[PDB]
Amino acid sequence: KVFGRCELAAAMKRHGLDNYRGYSLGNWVCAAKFESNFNTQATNRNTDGSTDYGILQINSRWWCNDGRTPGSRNLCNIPCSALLSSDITASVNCAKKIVSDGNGMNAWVAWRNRCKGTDVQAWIRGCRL
């Protein structure tokens, strides 16, 4: 499913991401925009053999099991395919585990290079939250 900007914001807010670990909603919508362009079915393979899945492009090396990433840890205890669902619940639950990790949202390269330090509030403006 391809989410609308405000539709995703509301869905993320309802799942408790607004200000989770101090990161405002704008940060999460911005990350999803540049990671997958709001497409829950987005997949991208990396040179190390791992693959990123879903709206938040969660990596198979440490967070989910896709059956083809040797030495993966599956920290979110879930099949990577579950992260491609129209229901973002799984991606959100795993993201909360990731952001609590230790490096915060810096775990997401697009957020560091394209969202961090910018006016993230702009991503939820005009929305009925």
Asked if 81 is part of the footprint of Na ion (rule: CB under 5 A), the reply reads no
- The window from 6-14, 20-28, 74-82, 85-93 that contacts Na ion (CB under 5 A) reads 74-82
Query: Nearer Cβ to Na ion, position 24 or 74?
Result: 74
Instruction: List the interface residues with Na ion, window 19-58 (CB under 5 A).
Output: none
For residue 108, give every residue at least 6 positions away whose Cβ sits within 8 Å of its Cβ, in sequence order, or none: 31, 35, 56, 57
Q: Shortest gap between Cβ of 50 and Na ion (angstroms)?
A: 8
Q: Is the dihedral of CA 13, 121, 7, 43 positive or negative?
A: negative
Quote the CA–CA distance of 129 and 117 in Å, as a whole number.
23
Query: Nearer Cβ to Na ion, position 48 or 119?
Result: 48
Among 42, 72, 76, 120, binds Na ion (CB under 5 A): 72
Asked if 74 is part of the footprint of Na ion (rule: CB under 5 A), the reply reads yes
> Number of residues in contact with Na ion, rule: CB under 5 A?
4
Nearest-CB residue for Na ion: 72
Query: Nearer Cβ to Na ion, position 100 or 118?
Result: 100
Task: Report residue 113 CA to chain centroid gap.
Answer: 15
Amino acid present at 121: Q
With 0-12 / 13-18 / 19 or more C-beta atoms within 10 angstroms meaning exposed / middle / buried, residue 37 is exposed
Say whether 35 is catalytic: yes
Residue 119 assigned ligand-binding role: no
Task: Reduce the DSSP state of residue 61 to 3 states and report it.
Answer: coil
Note the residues at the interface with Na ion (CB under 5 A): 65, 72-74
